[PDB]
Every structure is written in structure tokens, then in C-alpha cells.
Design a protein around this nucleic acid. Structure first.
Ligand SMILES: Nc1ncnc2c1ncn2[C@@H]1O[C@H](COP(=O)(O)O)[C@@H](O)[C@H]1O
Ligand SMILES: [Zn+2]
Length: 180
DNA sequence: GTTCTAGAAC
DNA sequence: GTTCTAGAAC
């Protein structure tokens, strides 16, 4: 198939789709995640094209902080009264091109959350905190990740609230109901 | 990244 | 027999 039509380039299409945009300014766009892994799941993307965190440098530090601030604003404007806990961050190894900040509520109540990679990508070291990425770019000038990130996706399923071990995705999803 | 589904796990 | 996971996708 074509490069532009490849599944890994899909965000470059969605970020220009008015029906998926919930916020726009002169630097970034916020879209709904096409396959949300919780009740609230947005992606903050800059207009300018940066393939991944591998291409981030100190020239992008202001942009990374602005993305962080816009994510917090969206949380207030769209889920302020819910008082849900939120996390913001990046996957240590992304699948989709174009740098994007995850903004996801911590219910993880979604039919799109279906497999172990989904869970561990948001609930292990694989999920890089936005603040940690920002500080790493500021102090070290680039984003580096340790070896072994793919193995983290294979870890046993463990609740993020009470750390209880669960034997399967369905049993995990049922357990998460208890923390609503 | 998602779908689809073969067969492993239960 | 059904649930559940995990690899191909030309
Ligand atoms: N076409 C798409 N439009 C919008 N979001 C998408 C699309 N395809 C995948 N996603 C989401 O983008 C994220 C990609 O994850 P990652 O590449 O690991 O940061 C996931 O949350 C997906 O659900
Ligand atoms: Zn729990």
C-alpha cells in the first residue's frame, strides 16, 4: 500500500478532521482518540510534524510544555465536574507517527481496551509521564528510553489502584468496576 | 494502531 | 464447549 494511506500515518488524517477536533490554537490540536481506552481519552498533537520523541530536541521544549498545559485545560473544560483522576504522557515506543500526548482518565472503562498490551502500555514504565519527558528534554536535551520496553507489555495484569493481580483482561475489566 | 480468528487455555 | 489470547495482514 501507499505511505500516506498506511495505518501508521492515520493521526495525520484525524488531526485535520473537524469532527474529531475538540480544541485548536496556533500551536496544537486536540482530538478524541479514535479507540479510547477510557471514558475520556484525547490526543494533543502539534501542528508541526515531529515523527516521535526520538526527533525531539530542546527547540521543542516550549511546545511540549504547551501541549501539557492544553491537556490540563481540556480536562477542566470537558471533564471538570467528573473529578476523575487523569494521567498525561507518551508511550515509550509509539505505533502511530506524529508526536502525540495521551490525556486519559484512570477509569480505563472502555470496550476498546481489549488486550494486555493496551493495559501495560498505560500502566507500566512504558507510559512516560508528560512531566518526566519535559524535564528530560530540558536537562538532557533529548528523550532516551531504557532497553526492555517491549517486555513490559508482557507483564502480568495488575490493578493500578490496589495492585491486585488479575489472570485475564475480562477479569481485570470486571475488577476495575470496583474502583469507580 | 486495528481486525480477524486459530487454537491454546480454561 | 466456551473463553481467551496472540500472530498475520501481500
Ligand atoms: N486513525 C486514528 N485516529 C485517531 N487516533 C488513533 C487512530 N489510530 C489509532 N489511534 C489512537 O492513537 C494511539 C496510538 O498509540 P501510540 O502510537 O502507542 O501512542 C492509541 O490511543 C490509538 O487508539
Ligand atoms: Zn484494584
Amino acid at each position: 500500500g501507499s505511505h500516506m494511506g498506511h495505518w501508521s500515518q492515520g493521526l495525520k488524517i484525524s488531526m485535520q478532521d473537524p469532527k474529531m477536533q475538540v480544541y485548536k490554537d496556533e500551536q496544537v490540536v486536540v482530538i478524541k482518540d479514535k479507540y479510547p481506552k477510557a471514558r475520556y481519552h484525547w490526543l494533543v498533537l502539534p501542528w508541526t510534524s515531529i515523527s516521535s520523541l526520538k526527533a525531539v530536541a530542546r527547540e521543542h521544549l516550549e511546545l511540549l510544555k504547551h501541549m501539557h498545559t492544553v491537556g490540563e485545560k481540556v480536562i477542566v473544560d470537558f471533564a471538570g465536574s467528573s473529578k476523575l483522576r487523569f494521567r498525561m504522557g507518551y508511550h515509550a515506543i509509539p505505533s502511530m507517527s506524529h508526536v502525540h500526548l495521551h490525556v486519559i482518565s484512570q477509569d480505563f472503562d472502555s470496550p476498546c481496551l481489549k488486550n494486555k498490551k493496551h493495559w501495560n502500555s498505560f500502566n507500566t514504565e512504558y507510559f512516560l509521564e508528560s512531566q518526566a519527558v519535559i524535564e528530560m528534554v530540558q536537562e538532557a536535551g533529548r528523550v532516551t528510553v531504557r532497553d526492555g520496553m517491549p517486555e513490559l507489555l508482557k507483564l502480568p495484569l495488575r490493578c493500578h489502584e490496589c495492585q491486585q493481580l488479575l489472570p485475564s483482561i475480562p477479569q481485570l475489566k470486571e475488577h476495575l468496576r470496583k474502583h469507580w
